[PDB]
């Protein structure tokens with residue numbers, strides 16, 4: 279059933295599971311037309327499918343061509359998401375298929391469940407966590423590959439860089455969601471924090487800067503301060 | 516007109532015949548029910564004065580034999596049985612009418628209620644859902660579970676109802692996942708009507724059967740079946756106009772006949788708001804929608 283604070287550590291056991299987030303699958307700008315009416319223009323999106331134990335990210339890029347001539351795109355996006363996740367499971371070898379897929383939004387349960395009827399033994403589950411994976415497009419290299427895509431494309435990443443060489447997946451996941459929670463609440467400040475010091479670079483095969491253990495500690499506290507603050511600035515406290 | 520005699524009434528009980536009911540006292544001189552309309556299926560049903568738990572009863576068609584009721588003090592219930600000695604049966608019936616120990620099936624001439632509730636209920640078809648071949652009549656009670664309920668525990672006492680499942684490979688064509696799940700016309704028209712029922716009359720036959728078992732016995736799996744079969748039509752954009760029109764009549768009489776106080780348990784808010792307000796058929800069930808709003812506006 280639902281995932282929440284109490285069954286948090288299940289994410290880090292040795293059962294293959296994926297999170298699916300569909301919040302960036304269907305993206306639009308809203309603009310005025312010559313006649314003064316409003317219109318949307320779609321932009322490339324992506325399905326964020328993440329193994330929280332390994333950090334493997336299966337970033338399925340949704341090119342705007344998939345929407346051409348379709349109606350009710352917001353509804354279609356959910357079914358397109360489910361179609362792509364299904365295709366992804368089927369392409370994995372059996373021993374790599376997940377035993378659970380956790381959708382970050384309840385509206386995905388029915389579409390995925392229906393697409394996954396061939397896999398009765400894979401549990402489709404919701405969550406009560408408020409996970410910040412929508413901020414995934416605030417990671418520069420992920421936004422970059424999405425916005426440049428000219429066709430549907432799947433790109434593989436490790437969203438933890440090499441962190442698992444030195445920390446556990448529980449810790450790695452907590453660092454990731456703190457980083458993403460901050461990037462979601464104040465993208466400019468969050469990004470300033472991450473890149474202020476020019477001597478800490480991002481390796482070509484990585485997504486985040488190459489912080490030492492101690493530098494990560496200072497970074498982590500700074501992102502904490504940022505979040506607590508924006509919470510004040512917002513509720514005036 | 517047919518007669519269902521009773522050997523005797525040893526225990527206080529409320530007896531139902533179709534939509535009619537009457538109290539009988541312990542060892543009151545009651546010998547059964549006369550003037551029953553030939554040409555329809557009937558149900559005679561029982562609730563003991565001592566144990567309102569377990570409503571139970573028997574579906575039967577008078578054309579398929581001479582049937583009578585006899586209390587069994589070992590099993591503790593009124594059992595239907597067949598008399599094959601037709602001479603013995605007419606003799607018995609005539610004696611009890613002469614002594615006027617029978618209640619008259621009390622049909623008002625204006626009233627088509629039972630016909631409208633049972634228009635397509637075949638009795639041979641009931642036998643293939645309440646499987647008990649050595650008997651020409653079929654026993655149902657409040658507690659019997661359905662075959663699909665035993666999937667999600669005795670199969671002999673089960674209600675083999677047509678299995679409907681909206682999230683199933685049967686319902687969902689590969690490559691049309693979104694399409695078949697939002698518009699179930701293919702599941703209804705090809706899989707169910709063309710593959711299982713043969714025609715809408717048979718769809719209605721089971722649907723009516725499912726409702727009556729929910730109403731007369733508060734059988735929960737039947738109530739679920741009635742709502743499933745409604746939901747499948749209301750979730751289909753493409754339904755023959757004649758089925759829609761007949762569904763509206765059907766549901767109208769069922770809603771009309773329901774006890775006003777049983778509404779909270781026998782009606783699924785979600786399915787009915789869908790049929791009446793959200794679904795493709797929101798505009799197509801005029802009689803059903805009018806009686807629901809005037810009689811159960813609380814549900815919607």
Ligand SMILES: CSc1nc(N)nc(-c2csc(C)n2)n1
Nearest residue numbers: 636637640711712717720721724
């Ligand atoms: C009363 S139960 C009932 N009634 C009718 N008229 N048909 C059916 C039925 C189910 S499947 C099939 C071919 N006929 N079931």
